């Protein structure tokens, strides 16, 4: 984790700062929904990396042609001033 | 409101996360943040629909939680990727 | 693979950690080196940006929220 | 006739005289050397940078022409 | 066909989303304690003394304007306000949720020129109040002109192959200005000759040419074959 | 009881989901628009008329020579605006555009944009054939997916992007 | 005069001088306001006044 | 006034009663929003500072780029500026038309360095403070927030002491020594 | 010292055969192409309704 | 006003002729219609409603 010293965090600006229950059913299905929800967390985290890392791929491939065509146009205009 | 908030708290929460309720579907995305005005409620069986879709009398559970809990099939795989999730996460 | 072949661009094993020094286990690669590395520096940089804030707190330092702070 | 407080304003400089402009919508006062006018509730919408200064306002109400002298 | 599912208002007013693990799509009763078609009702207790009412479901592969919602329009003309001409009303397959998604105010004037679902349809009619049978052929309006007054959408549900003649006869006499139409398209029993967005083409122009201006059409691909939902308003002055 | 910190009040000079993406057609495989087949209807525009005529090629025979198939071809009323409005010169070019082969639709949007009425109402249906001789009508057309073009050059039309060409 | 409008041969005035009728040489024949301002609805007295 | 029909709006486009052209797009009003000016006339008793000094820079590039008196004068007027610290650095002649301000030269104002110098959080609370009387600028009190500040002056911006604002922000580190009576 | 071939290319029919299945299953995502029609009995449409969205073509 | 409302043009009414309108009759009894022949031979009788 991050530390800090305490003679640093005890002297720092003011905005800077860095600041019953059921036994049985109820308890085993709130575990459940817990479950659930880790699951679902976990889940579409693995999607939302693989959406990520897809793009990753789809940038590479779009900026390697969107080069060599900038560079046809280039030669093409290149051409056209040269043939004045 | 509130007073039946507590009955409900849980399975528009679920219904949320239906992405990964079951490993055969893939609902398609939307967020469905809890909507204001709301309704719960029970399907009633057609009278010509018998022996198909009508679930019996001691089945009906009465909350889709504890339909949910229901089936343990479904029940054992949100336990073995629970337990593949756990010691993967420690 | 533009003019060269499958066994020209294989596979490179790794070698694993030690067995006589194996009680503080898995060596750590380059991989690893820049992976610890880049959180180090990334707190010392905080660390910095908050030695620098202290030094220059400017004491008139006033808000309204310093009562309920204390 | 109704006792309507429309716009009250203390300003603190010398006010010679003012006058409405075509309604109780908006009327011009005489300050101490700009003549200002303004809205229904006190704002104000002009310092006039002319009219360097002003004693006698009047208003030509079908030619909308406020006149200063 | 015992679970218990939630309900949630949808974009277009009166009809609503039954989301469950599966979500359907249903509408309102207006006969409550019954179910003509054959479909599943889904019934909520509203809790004064407590209330039961019952939502039955819009089935999309029985219903081509169910077809269309789930499909997706931009925006209806079936608002819960008005009144809606239901042009080739077979039976009570649609014509029920047009009518209960229009609500107790309005009224659905269904016609209809066939004699056996004519009468099954009027045996439908006397258990809900607000749709009005028609047991005439739609190609003359002038013979049904005596009891139905200036509608503010027209349905278009027939298959004959005169569709642009009906519906420009049955919107110039009786529908509004400003007013709604939705044409369902079927390009089978247009002409089966040539192919389906041909047949649109065609239909959409003569649409246009009789200044119904088409802002919409829709495909409803996965729930039936060559069929298309155009919306449109008559505009009446001012096509442009 | 007198406020603090009091301006002269001024006016202030500054403080006085539906989402739609239009689903691809039923009629639209990957890129081979799997719904057109003879007989085609052809859209005409105004410079394709004017080349025609200059190149004098026909218009419904050249159409059967170049793509062999019965070909309808459709002018918006749109575009005969503005092959009304092209002047005097171009009166063999009107009196060409009226013929009863070529059968003409209605419009409706206000002006007379011949080339955004005509990728307007292409890309409603994808069951029609665009003639022209534009570049940057052209560029509009085979930058959507997948309706097919023909121009005019040399002797006959010749045709882009069909597939059942021969 | 319009721009598509070319060498108009026969103008006639409709049976109620509110509309004047021109048929040009490009072969289109077009309608026209005679009082051009004007327009051709009922109007309450207060917009006749 | 009525938001005017079409043809209102076409038979007269000139009209404006809330904003004309010799308002200059309102810029006093909005500048003295923006800082918080209490009195009128502020924004141009600024501003014919800034016509005069802008008006003096053109007669001393007028003058000939040989003689003593414009060079001394220029330099001179230029540590002025820097002294009374208008600009931040003692940068060329053409900043005495691209970087002389009506907004810099109110932002030396006092209660906007009191904001900038994080003493009050907000210029109205600043306001709200040197009219209630707790700063102080040296030895001197000041009652009017009209005082701008010079360059030497930014350093001995502080409370008076017995203020009560003093006291609770010493309070709230706990460092609060009464001993010396605040 | 060939690279990896394919038993897939091997047969210039049956490759042409693998890919129009996957073409096939390929615009079950691009367009929602018709299956069949209603299979079972109408048990909902199995994968989500959403309101926010309107998957139908405007006409300028 | 008038020069901001003087818009004449009403429409033009059909697909126009073939060749070029020639000749135009009103008839004198009723109002929305006439009758029109254009140069290539082909005469027509136009409702103007
Ligand atoms: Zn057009």
């Known amino acids: 984790g991050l530390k800090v010293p305490k003679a640093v965090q005890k002297e720092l600006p003011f905005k800077s700062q860095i600041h019953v229950v059921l036994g049985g059913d109820e308890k085993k299905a709130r575990s459940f929904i817990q479950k659930v929800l880790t699951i679902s967390k976990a889940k579409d985290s693995k999607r939302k990396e693989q959406k990520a890392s897809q793009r990753k791929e789809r940038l590479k491939k779009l900026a390697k042609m969107e080069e060599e065509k900038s560079q046809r146009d280039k030669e093409k205009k290149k051409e056209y001033f040269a043939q004045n | 409101d509130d007073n039946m908030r507590r009955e409900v708290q849980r399975d528009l929460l679920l219904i949320k996360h239906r992405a990964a309720l079951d490993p055969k579907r893939h609902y398609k995305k939307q967020r469905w943040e809890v909507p204001e005005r709301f309704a719960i409620g029970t399907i009633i069986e057609d009278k010509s629909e018998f022996y198909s879709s009508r679930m019996n009398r001691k089945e009906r559970k009465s909350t889709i939680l504890e339909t949910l809990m229901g089936d343990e099939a479904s029940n054992k795989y949100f336990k073995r990727k629970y337990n593949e999730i756990q010691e993967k996460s420690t | 693979a533009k003019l060269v072949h499958d066994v020209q661009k294989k596979q490179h094993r790794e070698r694993s950690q030690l067995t006589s020094r194996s009680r503080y286990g898995f060596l750590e690669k380059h991989k690893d080196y820049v992976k610890r590395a880049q959180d180090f520096h990334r707190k010392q940089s905080t660390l910095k940006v908050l030695r620098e804030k202290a030094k220059e707190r400017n004491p008139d330092e006033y808000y309204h929220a310093m009562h309920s702070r204390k | 006739r109704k006792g309507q407080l429309r716009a009250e304003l203390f300003l603190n400089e010398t006010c010679h005289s ?52 | 066909g015992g679970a218990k599912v939630v309900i ?233 | 009881t007198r406020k603090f910190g009091l301006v002269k009040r001024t006016l202030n000079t500054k403080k006085d989901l539906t989402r739609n993406i239009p689903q691809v057609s039923s009629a639209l495989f990957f890129q081979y628009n799997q719904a057109i087949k003879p007989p085609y209807q052809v859209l005409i525009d105004t410079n394709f008329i004017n080349f025609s005529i200059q190149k004098k090629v026909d ?91 023909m121009s005019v050059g040399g002797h006959a039309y010749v045709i882009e992007k069909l597939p059942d060409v021969f | 005069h319009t721009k598509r409008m ?44 | 006034v009525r938001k005017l029909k079409h043809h209102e709006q076409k038979l007269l486009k000139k009209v404006d009663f809330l904003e004309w052209k010799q308002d200059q797009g309102h810029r006093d009003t909005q500048v003295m929003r923006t800082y918080h000016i209490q009195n009128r006339e502020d924004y141009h008793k600024y501003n014919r500072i800034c016509g005069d000094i802008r008006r003096l820079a053109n007669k001393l590039s007028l003058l000939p780029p040989t003689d003593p008196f414009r060079r001394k004068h220029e330099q001179l007027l230029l540590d002025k500026l820097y002294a009374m610290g208008v600009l931040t650095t003692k940068s060329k002649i053409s900043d005495l038309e691209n970087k002389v301000t009506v907004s810099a030269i109110c932002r030396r104002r006092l209660p906007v360095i009191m904001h900038r110098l994080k003493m009050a959080e907000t210029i109205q609370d600043a306001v709200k403070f040197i009219e209630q009387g707790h700063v102080r600028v040296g030895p001197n009190l000041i009652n009017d927030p009209a005082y701008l500040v010079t360059r030497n002056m930014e350093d001995y911006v502080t409370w008076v002491d017995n203020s009560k604002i003093k006291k609770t922000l010493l309070r709230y580190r706990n460092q609060i020594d009464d001993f010396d009576f605040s | 010292l060939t690279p990896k071939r394919n038993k897939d290319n091997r047969n210039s029919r049956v490759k042409k055969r693998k890919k129009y299945q996957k073409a096939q299953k390929k615009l079950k995502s691009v367009r929602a192409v018709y299956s069949g029609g209603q299979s079972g009995v109408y048990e909902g449409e199995k994968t989500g309704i959403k309101k926010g969205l309107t998957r139908s073509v405007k006409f300028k | 006003l008038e020069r901001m409302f003087a818009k004449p043009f009403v429409g033009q009414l059909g697909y126009g002729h073939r060749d070029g309108v020639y000749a135009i009759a009103k008839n004198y009894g009723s109002l929305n219609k006439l009758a029109t022949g254009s140069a290539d031979g082909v005469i027509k009788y136009w409702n103007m409603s």
Request: charged fraction near 25%; hydrophobic fraction near 35%.
């Open chain 4, 18 to 69: 003012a006058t409405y402009l075509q309604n109780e919508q908006y009327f011009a006062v005489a300050q101490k050397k700009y003549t200002f006018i303004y809205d229904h509730e006190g704002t104000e919408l002009h310092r006039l940078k002319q009219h360097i200064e002003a004693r006698h306002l009047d208003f030509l109400p079908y030619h909308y022409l406020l006149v200063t002298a």
């Open chain 7, 6 to 49: 070319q060498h108009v041969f026969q103008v006639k005035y409709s049976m109620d001088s509110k509309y004047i009728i021109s048929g040009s040489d490009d072969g289109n024949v077009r309608l026209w306001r005679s009082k051009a301002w004007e327009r051709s609805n009922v109007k309450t007295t207060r917009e006749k006044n």
């Open chain 5, 8 to 240: 949630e208002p949808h974009r277009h007013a009166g009809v609503y989303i039954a989301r469950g693990k599966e979500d359907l799509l249903v509408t309102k009763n207006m006969a409550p304690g019954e179910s003509v078609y054959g479909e599943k009702r889904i019934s909520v207790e509203e809790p004064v003394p407590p209330t039961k009412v019952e939502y039955r479901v819009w089935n999309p592969f029985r219903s081509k304007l169910a077809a269309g919602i789930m499909g997706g329009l931009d925006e209806l003309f079936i608002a819960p306000g008005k009144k809606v001409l239901y042009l080739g009303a077979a039976s009570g397959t649609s014509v029920s949720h047009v009518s209960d998604v229009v609500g107790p105010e309005g009224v659905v004037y269904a016609v209809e020129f066939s004699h056996r679902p004519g009468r099954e349809l009027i045996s439908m009619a006397k258990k809900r109040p607000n749709i009005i049978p028609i047991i005439e052929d739609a190609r003359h309006p002038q013979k049904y002109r005596m009891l139905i007054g200036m509608v503010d959408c027209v349905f278009a549900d027939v298959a004959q192959p005169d569709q642009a003649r009906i519906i420009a006869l049955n919107s110039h006499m009786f529908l509004k200005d400003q007013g709604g139409v939705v044409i369902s398209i079927k390009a089978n029993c247009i002409d089966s000759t040539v192919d389906a967005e041909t047949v649109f083409a065609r239909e959409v122009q003569k649409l246009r040419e009789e200044r119904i201006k088409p802002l919409e059409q829709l495909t409803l691909e996965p729930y039936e074959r060559d069929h298309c939902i155009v919306v449109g308003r008559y505009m009446r002055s001012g096509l442009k």
């Open chain 6, 59 to 149: 218009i419904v025979r050249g159409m059967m020579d170049c793509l062999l198939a019965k070909c309808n071809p459709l002018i918006t009323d749109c575009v005969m605006a503005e092959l009304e409005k092209l002047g005097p010169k171009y009166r063999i070019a009107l009196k060409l555009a009226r013929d009863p082969r070529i059968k003409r639709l209605s419009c409706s949007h206000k002006g007379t944009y011949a080339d955004d009425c005509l990728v307007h109402r292409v890309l409603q249906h994808k069951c029609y054939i665009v003639a022209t001789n534009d570049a940057g009508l052209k560029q509009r057309i085979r930058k959507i997916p997948g309706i097919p073009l």
